Amino acid sequence: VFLCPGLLKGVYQSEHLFESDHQSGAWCKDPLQASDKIYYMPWTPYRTDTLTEYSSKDDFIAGRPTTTYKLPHRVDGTGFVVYDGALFFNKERTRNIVKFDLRTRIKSGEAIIANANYHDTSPYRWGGKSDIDLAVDENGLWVIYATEQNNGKIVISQLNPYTLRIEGTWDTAYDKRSASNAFMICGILYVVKSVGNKIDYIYNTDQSKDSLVDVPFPNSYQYIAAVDYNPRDNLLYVWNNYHVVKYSLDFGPL
């Protein structure tokens, strides 16, 4: 139902919402619902198992939550998405995605992402990245991971949010270790790298074709940031070194 905005060509911060008391975390809306609801999950290393819900941006900024959800498992890293009333997250130190129904507060499904690497981060690196990242876009729900079969390079799969069937899988050429964030727009994978920071690689799943690109991120962006795209409003939902902000996006023709 969402029309593709085009090929991403620019990124800039467009709203500062508040400074959180947690350095890292993730936040997002449910793009499949016409709703002001906001979902918020601060990252506490190896202890993350609650989701907070706010009814509006005003309530969010003011710190007036509606409710909290106690998740049935702990979450790996910062990642989660909400898609048509269901929460999806990577179960801590597994290659599993959990589906949790928010309305009834119970787990409705799990899917093992075949061959996905997990619990394999070098001792030295910041542990806030999820082994399997989730992303929502115009085309549906996505998992972004790596496999040994693809030499630690990023693999993309489309996941049906209702049946949990894998609908397609693509091997990219990009080493997952080199990425700070990855997100989908119109079925195209954008990968953010350190240089400053920029998108330097895209993978178009419709075409099964990748390219090198150069889209600078703001200087204030850090590696430890969490970034999620929203296809309903075409914004990036960002959590960056305590700061809860949105980025706006400029597009050119596909």
Chain residues that interact with Mg ion, rule: CB under 5 A:
228
| Minimal distance, residue 253 CB to Mg ion, in Å | 25
Residue 7 or 191: the one with the smaller Cβ distance to Mg ion is 191
| Minimal distance, residue 139 CB to Mg ion, in Å | 15
CA distance 130 to 42: 14
Q: Which residue is nearest to Mg ion (CB)?
A: 228
| Minimal distance, residue 135 CB to Mg ion, in Å | 6
Cβ atoms of residues 98 and 89 within 8 Å: yes
Q: Is 227 annotated as a binding residue?
A: yes
Residue 30 or 228: the one with the smaller Cβ distance to Mg ion is 228
Chain breaks in the chain (C to N over 2.5 A) after: 195
CA distance 183 to 162: 21
Distances in whole angstroms, Cα of residue 240 to Cα of each of 42, 73, 93, 228: 12, 25, 23, 12
| Minimal distance, residue 169 CB to Mg ion, in Å | 19
Give 243's contacts (C-beta < 8 A, 6+ positions apart): 16, 19, 20, 220
Residue 2 or 59: the one with the smaller Cβ distance to Mg ion is 2
Q: Is 115 annotated as a binding residue?
A: no
The one-letter code for the residue type at 238 is: V
Q: Is 182 annotated as a binding residue?
A: yes
Cβ atoms of residues 140 and 160 within 8 Å: yes
| Minimal distance, residue 64 CB to Mg ion, in Å | 25
CA distance 250 to 119: 36
Residue 31 or 104: the one with the smaller Cβ distance to Mg ion is 31
Residue 80 or 100: the one with the smaller Cβ distance to Mg ion is 80
* Residue numbering of the annotated binding site for Ca(2+): 133, 181-182, 227
